[PDB]
């Protein structure tokens, strides 16, 4: 029946951790309390220097053993209560009751809101490591929940908390439930509530604005570190944490037609797909504006026919165009002389006998334009690459072209495009997805 | 179930604590371990400087809070396990079996012996603070004991251990069980054995001798601090820790006729009583051989009439003698010229206070027999000096004609005939039947 | 098998780790080999899929248990051999030759150079965390070293390696010996040599540039993360890793006149002292040219009298000046009308609160010299704010005294000067930082 | 409701005015909480009023009492405690709370009022140094603000402050309290209020006083030994010692490794041990100079002389180098190879086990020592045959230079700075290793 209060979410420049710890100490002078930090907080916390109150510094240090940063080693009790800064212990026995709430219930974490300006509300949460995405929403089975948002004391067993890979990664409210929801654990939000501190931290607009900013920075670094590129919400809100126009793309050059993320049993990072989708939309826009006749090719046509979007592990977009229209588009005229950075940042190059448009000078997510010319009613070209799907095809497949949803817009595809896709890939290609190179890595 | 190992019994100059602690760490790397020492052990213990292994220094220090020397602040777990030096954890999960045994059973402590040359064995023990006595014997209902002798891992709840007044006084083997047995607590000796250290401490004959010496000195200091004058064992073995012939008596000058121990709700220390009996016996023998007519007086006669022994809170022995007999006894003759130390170290002297003699056990220990000389006037025994006590009166000489034998303090003493009537005349009716402290207005039974 | 080969220093884009692994299995099929990486290396390594070869990915992951990112999990042997990329096992049975060497000797680490272009050289190393410095030099007791430079297989007991805080932090060649030297452990460089890979990694100038760019960035992040602000070779060729003119000072704002580094049981960062010496010399150079009578004051005069430098745990320089002299310095006159950033980046300010001047290293780095103006009153040096008054004869004359790399002026009889303001014996009894007492207050 | 608990700790059981003290405070508030603390039950009996707010707190372990019984805070329900010394009396109602209003309205954590005895409390300065095992008393420069008191004072502080010290009621309280509070930087403000003396004051005869002063001094000397105070000084002088000397053992035992016990307790060398080493160094030097042995400071002694002219504060021996061709001129030295030599002044001179050096110990029992290292000049370089210890050129000794050290003048090698850096490394004088307790804990 012994519970270690463990404090991790606080700002060194402005906290109420002294009040927090003293408030628990008034209910039990021998109360085990562990304040955790990456480095020594300054200005000093000035905690009581008694054996049951310890400061656990989790960063590596040349004069400290491995144990010194492993937090479970500061915790001897069966249960641990994560307490946010701004909380206060007043009524005695509140942790005893969360403990017997836990043993009675079936959720492996119980939680009690702190009566702050943002008391913990309950959230649904699915984590897709394969798609680098976490999706929150309202919780159907509240007070049974996957995740919380807001301030709460969270009690669970030390064996449960400290077997996680990142038990106290900040922000705790995000990092913890990402790991427990993935494991299928539930948090049950009890009806107990902890009081707020009497002199709460971040009392001024300047202080809380500095806290929020540093807090947004920790959260971004956390999600980047743990393979979450995108956080989405019921209602449509999106939080992006990956590549954009000014960065590089999220993965290096692709060997064996098998991108790095597949070997990590992951698919294309959602920010990379999104850059491809806007490059695709942009390139189609200037192609159509130039009167260049284009059509979805390769995996782009496949993904469009299969589910109207980029195949979730693909990393480029492929369009075929008529060779004799190439001249009508300015960017492409220039691309034959050299690389072309147009007024919107996209990079047009010729390299191969095809053209490539890159999202930006730094982000090399590309659209490939393959020019074909007709010879005896057969679309062909003069340079080949060793792939099953790089072949000639009858021109009647382009007479006419048909509207086909793709990557958020309506594209042009060959008529009878399922027959077209069967021609280049083999029978059943639409219904039988497979990785770009099953020889090395197969879905 | 989380259990803190707590090491309190070891010697800084030769121990196996590093191996003890490391052997528990090889079963659980985050095992909470608390080494408790009065002062920082030198040479260094060199325990792993890791957060789950702490060293509790229970000394006062100018730069530490009160909590620093209170061992409960170093234990966060619900159960704690006292582990003696020389024990090593072999079998994984030995303490988990101890915790569930304790919750299944009804004893507040459970114990596992360690496979040393002296594994813990079951003992009975009652403690009598009023008589400063601890009485050990064989355990009637083993494996449920009041106390153990020898090396054991003892597991209990921290709340129970650290509500004791001296949880880790040394030797813990003695200290712990006097406190738990006085509280009616049982220790269940389990059929679980911890292994001994592969390199046991005290390997040399010189170190064990040095180790036993500190232990015996620590043990004697413990019982003196706790009011245990006498430790008795079935089979009759007696260990004493009070006064003796060559020290001072246990208590100081008695004021108000009420000795210090009575206010502490204890009776006369067993060592003082024993000195008084052997002084009473010896003086009676001197007086008989010298031809001095004596009889038991005051509290000595009263105690004799009640149960043939000194009243359990009394501090002296009183005898009456015939004044015309003092010249018969060599020690009494010298006493009037000055204080005399005789053939056996007893000190005979005439008292400052009116006209009586006093025989002290030794020069240093002033437990004493008082010799009150009386002389007859008209068949009335009297003296020229009188203390201001109610039992200090004249009495008819016929009470002394003749004397009757009466057991007292292990020998047969001489007493007034009709000593009931004698005692009631001096103390008031019913004195024999109604024991009472020497001054009820200050401290009553 | 008593040794687990553990390879940590390699690059995903160009390596010879497959050759490395293969070479050791060709000598023993059962050889335990762990390739450690922060994330899954790409292009794939395609090492043998056997139980004794395991890839340890040490970064925390949402789907993995805590044990998965701890290197001791992947090692079940008594000894670990740290093998750098580019090494290769050619002769058989040299890892246990390295074991029999470790057993017999007194060093906790043994090492054998790899026959690369950069084979391991024996190095001396002392780590002072209180001075945030790593001092390297040639090894006086070679082949017994405190550190290596270059390619070597290093073998030590797995219990020793994985008990350190940062056992596999990169670069290993730097992180390992910063940890083991600090513990006073030694490394014995054997007369044994590992062959190089027959297809050595980073064979091109471009690959080597990419590797060194990344390796230098790792090294700088490691030194910062472990509080090594200065690295030196034989007292020279200094490499800095702390603050400078374009950053903030290392310790931020000071509360209770106790800077952060004291609570971390250290002295002033050496990059901060270097800035303080530079500002003291710059300000003294500016006062001497403007014709401003100054003298060292407080802890700078005490430092100068004791060892002729800034006291190694102090964080500012203090100078006394004549108040009537301030009008002769452009910055001082401008500082009284507001904050001044002069031609060389120092900011001269007139603290409204204390009635004194302050010259900071730069707009961002607030290490500062304090200027305290006195004016003569009836023979005594005084001011209107409050550190004591003192007779003027201490300044008639003023005396050359070495301090912080240059000759500054101090009160005459400065030992008596110091004794009056600080107490007798002050020069001989430094208040050494007291971490124990600082905890109590 | 009363907010102050009177606490009485300094009295003698054989002679006291505690019954009068207690009656005086109850005479002004019959519900006033009063606690009398003692190690054992005071005899002769105190016979205090058998009332619930008067309690005897017996502070020693007892076989039949709970832990709380020997803890003084158990006996105090108020925010404030007034330590009252025997001999004091409450004649003027209301002073207890004027001390409380004064404490609240001021900035010192303790306030005090003198008792109008023959020894009324005087204001003192006190800096404690655990590293140097010294308490340094002096006149209080900022009176009425003190670090310590001398004499009889009712001292009032918060219960929470007093009972969180390690030895709140250790005797004599006038020593133990202020050693602990001055160490923390706390201040005691001696108010301008006065308590009356007992109408029948305790210890009114010389014999009674003599008994009380002998017990007090014994408690004080035990208190300083237990607490690691080896030297009390008044205005830098009037030294009072509580450590080792010529007839005791030396404070630390046999040293293991190169680390004496005092280092692991985060202290430096005991001042008694430094004092005996200065006495021995001077004695040894005086003997060698009289006998005509060429000596010079060596090792850490030369380093201490160069740096600040004394033994380095955490060093435990003195080293001197001597010319071997000169040993025959010292009687104690020639006898030293025959065997151990106690000289006329108690110093023990012995030849090395096998190390080939001479050791002069302060006494047979106190093994603080000066080591004499003989060298000879092979080709102008100083050598010994078995072994900071290094060869060094002989010209450093031609000639020898005077150098102040340990309260006298000793001979040093010429250019001792260059010498020291050959021996220890560059800049050894200016950057002193003071012991790192953490690193030594790490090892
Ligand atoms: N049966 C198949 C065959 C290919 N594909 C995908 O279609 C894409 C074709 O790549 P290209 O656009 O380079 O032709 C690849 O991402 C490949 O994995 C698929 O999803 N199902
Ligand atoms: N009714 C009584 C009266 C006295 N006594 C005891 O008898 C003793 C008398 O002491 P003296 O005769 O030595 O003066 C005391 O120990 C006293 O307590 C008793 O046990 N019962
Ligand atoms: N006796 C002293 C007094 C100060 N010093 C140090 O020199 C500096 C002088 O203090 P101020 O800068 O506060 O004047 C402080 O770091 C101080 O502790 C010292 O090293 N020895
Ligand atoms: N830089 C250094 C090096 C050694 N020392 C001191 O030198 C002494 C060791 O030298 P000895 O072996 O000569 O005694 C120790 O007191 C040690 O603290 C020092 O105070 N500063
Ligand atoms: C989580 O996934 C489940 C599928 O099992 C789905 O029903 C639910 O809507 C998802 N919730 C969120 C917030 O995405
Ligand atoms: C993980 O769980 C196991 C089993 O409950 C436990 O033994 C271990 O200590 C846990 N790990 C921690 C607490 O780091
Ligand atoms: C682990 O490291 C710490 C160093 O801080 C040390 O005290 C401990 O004994 C080490 N344990 C082992 C087995 O080396
Ligand atoms: C403890 O008390 C019981 C009950 O009087 C008694 O039978 C038993 O003998 C006592 N124990 C000892 C060891 O004398
Ligand atoms: C004493 O027991 C009580 C339970 O009645 C518990 O709350 C308290 O913590 C215990 N005290 C110590 C010092 O362990
Ligand atoms: C490193 O420290 C040792 C300590 O004795 C010193 O003597 C040596 O000269 C130092 N070397 C360097 C390169 O600083
Ligand atoms: C106490 O410390 C101050 C500051 O170091 C010093 O000036 C003073 O003399 C010290 N007091 C005594 C009595 O030593
Ligand atoms: Mg494609
Ligand atoms: Mg393509
Ligand atoms: Mg009697
Ligand atoms: Mg009598
Ligand atoms: Mg300064
Ligand atoms: Mg300043
Ligand atoms: Mg020395
Ligand atoms: Mg020596
Ligand atoms: Zn991306
Ligand atoms: Zn006795
Ligand atoms: Zn810096
Ligand atoms: Zn000493």
Residue numbers in the entry:
A (entry chain D): 47 to 397, 400 to 491
B (entry chain B): 47 to 491
C (entry chain C): 47 to 432, 438 to 492
D (entry chain A): 46 to 432, 437 to 492
Can you quote the paper on this entry?
Although FKRP exhibits RboP transferase, not NTase activity, our crystal structure clearly shows that FKRP belongs to the NTase superfamily as proposed previously. Our structural and biochemical analyses revealed the acceptor substrate recognition mechanism by dimer FKRP: the phosphate group of RboP is recognized by the catalytic domain of one subunit, and a phosphate group on O-mannose is recognized by the stem domain of another subunit. Indeed, mutations of FKRP, which is involved in synthesis of a tandem RboP structure, cause congenital muscular dystrophy;17–23 more than 15 missense mutations in the FKRP gene were found in LGMD2I (limb-girdle muscular dystrophy type 2I), MDDGB5 [muscular dystrophy-dystroglycanopathy (congenital with or without mental retardation, type B, 5)], and severe muscle-eye-brain disease/Walker-Warburg syndrome (MEB/WWS) patients (OMIM ID of FKRP; 606596).
To understand the molecular basis of the unique substrate recognition and catalytic reaction of FKRP, we determined the crystal structures of the sFKRP-CDP-Rbo complex with Ba2+ and the sFKRP-CMP complex with Mg2+ at 2.23 Å and 2.60 Å resolution, respectively. Since FKRP is active with the Mg2+, CDP-Rbo would be catalyzed and only the CMP moiety would remain under the Mg2+-containing condition. The crystal structure of the sFKRP-CMP complex revealed a similarity of the metal ion coordination sites to those of NTase; one Mg2+ at site I coordinates Asp362 and Asp364, while the other Mg2+ at site II coordinates Asp362, Asp364, and Asp416.
